[PDB]
């Protein structure tokens, strides 16, 4: 069984005080706190084994190159990719999606084609496709939402056709906590020869993820949401696709040869898309984060978080004039507004009690617009959050409602 | 005065053993070791103040946003930019140059124009321009080299004309240690209305850099070469230029608004070019690295390194059949080959003695080709290297020459 007290003791930030009160960090969906196992792994690398990593001749460089490729292997096993060489290190989910849209998009999406996104997508999974569609003259289609925060799947027959090149879809909504039916949607997309990119930035920390079972063509996620360092993400691409992708004009690609007369050639994928000095510190920390999470067990984490979520939704029923957004079976986040008060004011009061939530449009303005609100509040309930922190959130909202209503 | 023993005691890697022998790290031009002040600043941030940073409502987020903007201010003072808002955080020098070539290049370089690079450029300051020139149908012109590793300045009249849009030039060669006459070249470029991008990745750790005095239009450098963390670089752009640059299609740009019907708008520069979650860990560490280097004083560092370089070049005269490449007044690096032996073999023997040098083409294949060699060895002499490590290098080359000659 999972022991939240043993886990919390690994996270030094959770001791912190904010406004003279004990921190209740409910904003892990924006970024997760990191255990000392992650922080110290990165520091230890800088302290005892740091070097540049392009299979340099000397020992530190060779050993650091091997550390980085072992992390690539560990990450591929974490998401059950067939091969470590199907994983590209990227700056984060945002850059990973941009890479696909520029390298794969520019040579597979032509004038008259269409791309399907959903109305709940984070901006990082909208804007690259908007721009691509403008470049090549294709059409961006949108799966609409239901009031309960799920996709209107009945609209799919009107969106998928033979010119559909790509479905770009979120695994788990960063606002609603909706988990989308990826395996079925991927079957539909592949029946039309469409690829699927899955934005998995909110999924990989909540339960096991198996890209072979899903059969998705691309999958992205962010280190810093996975209790890991900033500046590092993972992009998975099916080997047959990845080995056809051209070099990344926009972000830089690693060369095989450079000639002023004869031009330039490029090294094989993965590494083709990792130009310049990689973020070795971040890669080391990401590896430690994958080990930490695997050691707790994602199924134990999921069971604890689901129980915590069920407790919170039950307790929140006693908050007057609370509006919740999203389905009952949400993962990780609770999106809400309190009566007619602006989310910004609710979040400031909650911060005044030492409760960290996020306010605003959460990089999902089309989602905001669907619900005809400018902003919502969002509380994250991660593996190190407690029933007691849920009770502070509930009491906090009750007090805010009396003081301001 | 500078005390190399007091400085070395700040760097924990320098205690390390390699192949059972004490490390002599002479590969700082590939990446620098980091002091504990840098390592611990990053760890301390993760331990006590970590949060997401997009001016979030709650305290940790607000305080982390302010930490990151103070580092931007500190970096702008470090290079004497007029305004902190002229600095963009980037993944590294490679990504910074790609950003300029894609955002500024695509809307200022048209068919029939030309760009001037030099023959000693690192690949990161060649390939983006090669691709841009192919996109828009412009011409890539090259300032050639002299045998001593300096630019043939007499060729400039034949390269600069009214269609010259940009000069992209290295401040200090990562292979030869040549320092280029930037201020004079920038005057010439501006007489034709050409902009200048300076690749300063090898300059910022060796002496003060003043972008107002230089009057360059762009300037880039890498954190990890500045005794700082990986995954972070600085791109400086003159405010009038930067505020005109369009969003970065290839790498992602931060939105002001996203609408599925009305399209997308973008936030003001700096931040326009920092999409997704920034590398907050790396930014914090970079700030500590700038403080550490400022506390030693760049002029003291320069005086120590110059003395160390002069000692090494004097000692190396006693190595039979040593070929050196570059001018006598080189900064930081010594590029060399030993008789007819492949650089790879020399580097392996040196590594066997615990001496870390770099071998290969050093991401400067046109430079290699100018000298009609496939590879060279390169020893870096940074601020924490000693006369004794120079003596190990010299003795090592002498032994290699007897064993293999
Ligand atoms: C946060 C998030 C992103 C963006 O991730 P970055 O690490 O900031 O690049 C994209 N999609 C979802 C669903 C997210 O939650
Ligand atoms: C190392 C270096 C680069 C590339 O820097 P990255 O940090 O790897 O992106 C570019 N130019 C010069 C002169 C360099 O030494
Ligand atoms: Cl956004
Ligand atoms: Cl290269």
Short mmCIF file of C-alpha atoms in Angstrom, two decimals, chain B residues 136-327:
data_model
loop_
_atom_site.label_atom_id
_atom_site.label_comp_id
_atom_site.label_asym_id
_atom_site.label_seq_id
_atom_site.Cartn_x
_atom_site.Cartn_y
_atom_site.Cartn_z
CA UNK B 136 14.62 32.45 -49.62
CA UNK B 137 17.11 32.02 -52.47
CA UNK B 138 19.89 34.22 -51.01
CA UNK B 139 23.65 33.63 -51.20
CA UNK B 140 25.96 32.56 -48.34
CA UNK B 141 29.35 34.28 -48.53
CA UNK B 142 32.41 33.27 -46.52
CA UNK B 143 35.29 35.32 -45.12
CA UNK B 144 38.34 33.06 -45.68
CA UNK B 145 41.17 32.32 -43.26
CA UNK B 146 44.89 33.05 -43.16
CA UNK B 147 47.33 30.25 -42.28
CA UNK B 148 47.77 31.76 -38.81
CA UNK B 149 44.07 31.36 -38.02
CA UNK B 150 42.96 34.97 -38.52
CA UNK B 151 40.36 36.24 -40.99
CA UNK B 152 41.44 37.57 -44.41
CA UNK B 153 40.01 41.04 -43.83
CA UNK B 154 41.16 42.23 -47.28
CA UNK B 155 38.41 40.12 -48.83
CA UNK B 156 35.65 42.17 -47.15
CA UNK B 157 35.29 44.68 -50.07
CA UNK B 158 34.40 41.77 -52.32
CA UNK B 159 31.85 40.31 -49.86
CA UNK B 160 29.95 43.36 -48.52
CA UNK B 161 27.55 45.11 -50.89
CA UNK B 162 24.13 46.75 -50.69
CA UNK B 163 22.33 43.37 -50.67
CA UNK B 164 24.27 42.15 -47.59
CA UNK B 165 21.60 41.64 -44.95
CA UNK B 166 23.61 40.08 -42.13
CA UNK B 167 27.12 39.33 -40.93
CA UNK B 168 27.23 36.30 -38.63
CA UNK B 169 30.65 36.12 -36.99
CA UNK B 170 32.29 34.39 -34.06
CA UNK B 171 33.70 36.49 -31.24
CA UNK B 172 36.34 33.90 -30.30
CA UNK B 173 37.02 30.72 -32.29
CA UNK B 174 36.22 27.54 -30.33
CA UNK B 175 39.15 25.83 -32.11
CA UNK B 176 41.88 28.41 -32.72
CA UNK B 177 41.22 30.84 -29.87
CA UNK B 178 41.32 33.70 -32.38
CA UNK B 179 39.55 36.83 -31.15
CA UNK B 180 37.96 38.66 -34.11
CA UNK B 181 37.95 42.48 -34.56
CA UNK B 182 34.22 42.78 -33.91
CA UNK B 183 33.94 46.51 -33.30
CA UNK B 184 35.59 47.41 -36.62
CA UNK B 185 33.73 44.72 -38.58
CA UNK B 186 30.42 45.92 -37.10
CA UNK B 187 31.16 49.47 -38.26
CA UNK B 188 31.74 48.14 -41.79
CA UNK B 189 28.57 46.03 -41.69
CA UNK B 190 26.41 48.92 -40.50
CA UNK B 191 27.73 51.15 -43.31
CA UNK B 192 25.79 48.85 -45.66
CA UNK B 193 22.74 48.51 -43.42
CA UNK B 194 23.71 44.95 -42.52
CA UNK B 195 22.97 43.58 -39.07
CA UNK B 196 25.60 41.64 -37.11
CA UNK B 197 24.97 38.51 -35.08
CA UNK B 198 27.93 37.70 -32.84
CA UNK B 199 28.46 34.11 -31.69
CA UNK B 200 29.98 34.81 -28.29
CA UNK B 201 29.86 31.32 -26.78
CA UNK B 202 33.66 31.25 -26.33
CA UNK B 203 34.08 34.90 -25.31
CA UNK B 204 31.92 35.61 -22.26
CA UNK B 205 34.05 33.56 -19.80
CA UNK B 206 37.42 35.04 -20.82
CA UNK B 207 37.05 38.84 -20.45
CA UNK B 208 34.36 41.53 -20.08
CA UNK B 209 31.90 41.82 -22.97
CA UNK B 210 30.09 45.09 -23.69
CA UNK B 211 27.38 44.85 -26.36
CA UNK B 212 26.77 48.63 -26.31
CA UNK B 213 30.46 49.30 -27.03
CA UNK B 214 30.47 46.57 -29.70
CA UNK B 215 27.13 47.88 -31.04
CA UNK B 216 26.27 44.38 -32.28
CA UNK B 217 22.65 43.63 -33.20
CA UNK B 218 22.53 40.07 -31.81
CA UNK B 219 24.80 38.32 -29.32
CA UNK B 220 24.51 34.70 -28.06
CA UNK B 221 26.26 32.55 -25.49
CA UNK B 222 25.78 29.32 -23.52
CA UNK B 223 25.31 28.89 -19.77
CA UNK B 224 27.20 25.60 -19.54
CA UNK B 225 30.37 27.14 -20.95
CA UNK B 226 30.05 29.95 -18.38
CA UNK B 227 30.46 27.56 -15.42
CA UNK B 228 26.68 27.29 -15.36
CA UNK B 229 24.00 24.62 -15.74
CA UNK B 230 23.08 22.92 -18.99
CA UNK B 231 19.93 23.75 -20.93
CA UNK B 232 20.19 27.53 -20.79
CA UNK B 233 21.61 30.25 -23.01
CA UNK B 234 21.26 33.99 -23.50
CA UNK B 235 20.28 35.73 -26.73
CA UNK B 236 20.66 39.52 -26.75
CA UNK B 237 18.84 41.56 -29.42
CA UNK B 238 18.75 45.34 -29.84
CA UNK B 239 15.34 46.46 -28.57
CA UNK B 240 14.28 48.13 -31.84
CA UNK B 241 15.07 44.93 -33.76
CA UNK B 242 13.61 42.54 -31.18
CA UNK B 243 10.25 44.32 -30.98
CA UNK B 244 9.80 43.90 -34.75
CA UNK B 245 10.58 40.18 -34.90
CA UNK B 246 7.62 37.89 -35.72
CA UNK B 247 6.69 34.85 -33.60
CA UNK B 248 8.97 31.81 -33.85
CA UNK B 249 7.05 29.36 -36.06
CA UNK B 250 9.67 26.62 -35.71
CA UNK B 251 10.34 26.66 -31.98
CA UNK B 252 7.09 27.96 -30.52
CA UNK B 253 6.05 31.41 -29.28
CA UNK B 254 4.08 32.47 -26.21
CA UNK B 255 0.50 33.57 -26.96
CA UNK B 256 -1.47 36.57 -25.79
CA UNK B 257 -4.80 35.10 -26.99
CA UNK B 258 -5.85 31.88 -28.73
CA UNK B 259 -9.18 31.66 -30.55
CA UNK B 260 -10.41 28.86 -32.78
CA UNK B 261 -12.43 31.35 -34.89
CA UNK B 262 -10.41 34.59 -34.64
CA UNK B 263 -6.88 33.12 -34.59
CA UNK B 264 -3.94 33.84 -32.30
CA UNK B 265 -2.05 36.91 -31.03
CA UNK B 266 1.34 36.98 -29.30
CA UNK B 267 2.82 38.61 -26.24
CA UNK B 268 5.56 41.24 -26.38
CA UNK B 269 9.21 40.26 -26.99
CA UNK B 270 11.51 38.87 -24.74
CA UNK B 271 8.65 36.70 -23.54
CA UNK B 272 7.29 36.12 -27.04
CA UNK B 273 10.29 33.84 -27.69
CA UNK B 274 10.11 31.89 -24.40
CA UNK B 275 7.22 29.49 -25.06
CA UNK B 276 6.24 26.73 -22.66
CA UNK B 277 7.59 26.30 -19.17
CA UNK B 278 11.04 27.96 -18.97
CA UNK B 279 14.02 26.12 -17.54
CA UNK B 280 13.68 27.73 -14.12
CA UNK B 281 16.30 25.46 -12.55
CA UNK B 282 18.81 26.39 -15.25
CA UNK B 283 17.98 30.11 -15.07
CA UNK B 284 18.58 30.11 -11.29
CA UNK B 285 21.90 28.33 -11.76
CA UNK B 286 22.92 30.70 -14.54
CA UNK B 287 22.28 33.60 -12.20
CA UNK B 288 24.52 32.06 -9.56
CA UNK B 289 27.18 31.47 -12.23
CA UNK B 290 27.13 35.14 -13.28
CA UNK B 291 27.54 36.14 -9.60
CA UNK B 292 30.41 33.69 -9.08
CA UNK B 293 32.27 34.94 -12.16
CA UNK B 294 31.60 38.60 -11.33
CA UNK B 295 32.92 38.02 -7.80
CA UNK B 296 36.26 36.72 -9.12
CA UNK B 297 36.35 39.54 -11.69
CA UNK B 298 36.66 38.93 -15.42
CA UNK B 299 39.80 41.03 -15.69
CA UNK B 300 41.49 38.95 -12.98
CA UNK B 301 40.35 35.79 -14.78
CA UNK B 302 41.71 37.11 -18.07
CA UNK B 303 45.08 37.93 -16.50
CA UNK B 304 45.39 34.50 -14.95
CA UNK B 305 44.31 32.66 -18.12
CA UNK B 306 46.64 34.71 -20.31
CA UNK B 307 49.61 33.93 -18.06
CA UNK B 308 48.60 30.25 -18.04
CA UNK B 309 48.33 30.26 -21.85
CA UNK B 310 51.73 31.90 -22.23
CA UNK B 311 53.27 29.29 -19.94
CA UNK B 312 51.71 26.44 -21.94
CA UNK B 313 52.78 27.74 -25.34
CA UNK B 314 56.31 28.20 -24.00
CA UNK B 315 56.41 24.66 -22.53
CA UNK B 316 54.86 23.10 -25.62
CA UNK B 317 57.84 24.27 -27.71
CA UNK B 318 59.72 21.30 -26.21
CA UNK B 319 57.28 18.74 -27.68
CA UNK B 320 58.78 17.22 -30.86
CA UNK B 321 56.70 17.35 -34.06
CA UNK B 322 53.91 19.32 -32.45
CA UNK B 323 51.82 21.25 -34.94
CA UNK B 324 49.84 24.14 -33.44
CA UNK B 325 46.94 25.84 -35.21
CA UNK B 326 45.86 29.42 -34.63
CA UNK B 327 47.56 32.69 -33.72
#
